């Protein structure tokens, strides 16, 4: 309610305020073995090739 009241003061829509709550442990595995299973929403780091060459 503190934000939504202040949004109307500034003159902004409070439609997508919630879009919400977080409780997730997180970490980074650098160069694992090939047998390691990949879970859902596991963001992998990628060294891309050159776009031009």
């Amino acid at each position: 309610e503190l934000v939504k009241n202040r949004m109307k003061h500034l003159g902004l829509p409070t439609t997508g305020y919630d879009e919400d709550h977080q409780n997730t442990l997180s970490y980074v595995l650098i160069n694992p073995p090939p047998d390691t299973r990949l879970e859902l929403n596991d963001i992998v780091y990628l060294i891309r090739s050159d776009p031009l060459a």
Binding site: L2, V3, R6, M7, L10, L12, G16, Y17, D20, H21, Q22, L25, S26, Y27, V28, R48, D50, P51
Partner: protein, 171 residues
């Protein structure tokens, strides 16, 4: 989704933020907008450099003022980027060097749990104050291991501290 950055002055370091973000190898539709929230007004040495890059803006105020943030559009913003402010760098104790950056992030942590944050600290000793709750489940458990690691002769003791592994903190 928007990116938003916080700093004391718009120095030549913040040019070096925007260069690797705005790159030819990055996709055009992927291009995240940038908003540099600043305490002091920026000079023309910065403005002429940043000018050429696309959809990058600046705004006055602080992280402390909730009015300043909501104008910048932190609700649908992907990443807040709090940076060590040059005035508060110099301090006698380790706690008072980064007290205000910790407390202002702690309000943002409660107000906007969806909002991902990228906080800075001068010392890694202030890691324990970053994200705070009344749970204390992994707070004591992770502290036990890193203290035992430092006794064994480990380089990376702070590694197991949870905020660091997630990438939310960096020094």
């Amino acid at each position: 989704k928007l990116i938003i950055v916080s700093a004391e002055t718009a120095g030549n370091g913040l040019y070096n933020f925007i260069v690797p973000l705005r790159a030819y190898y990055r996709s055009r539709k992927e291009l995240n907008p940038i908003v540099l929230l600043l305490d002091n007004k920026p000079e023309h040495h910065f403005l002429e450099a940043i000018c050429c890059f696309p959809m990058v803006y600046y705004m006055e105020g602080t992280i402390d003022n909730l009015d300043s943030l909501l104008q910048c559009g932190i609700i649908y913003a992907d990443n807040l980027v709090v940076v060590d402010k040059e005035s508060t760098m110099s301090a006698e104790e380790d706690y008072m060097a980064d007290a205000k950056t910790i407390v202002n992030v702690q309000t943002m942590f409660r107000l906007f749990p969806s909002l991902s944050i990228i906080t800075e600290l001068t010392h890694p000793s202030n890691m324990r104050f970053m994200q705070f709750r009344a749970k204390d489940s992994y707070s004591l458990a992770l502290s036990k291991l890193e203290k035992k690691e430092r006794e064994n002769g480990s380089n990376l003791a702070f590694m197991f501290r949870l905020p660091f592994a997630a990438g939310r903190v960096f020094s």
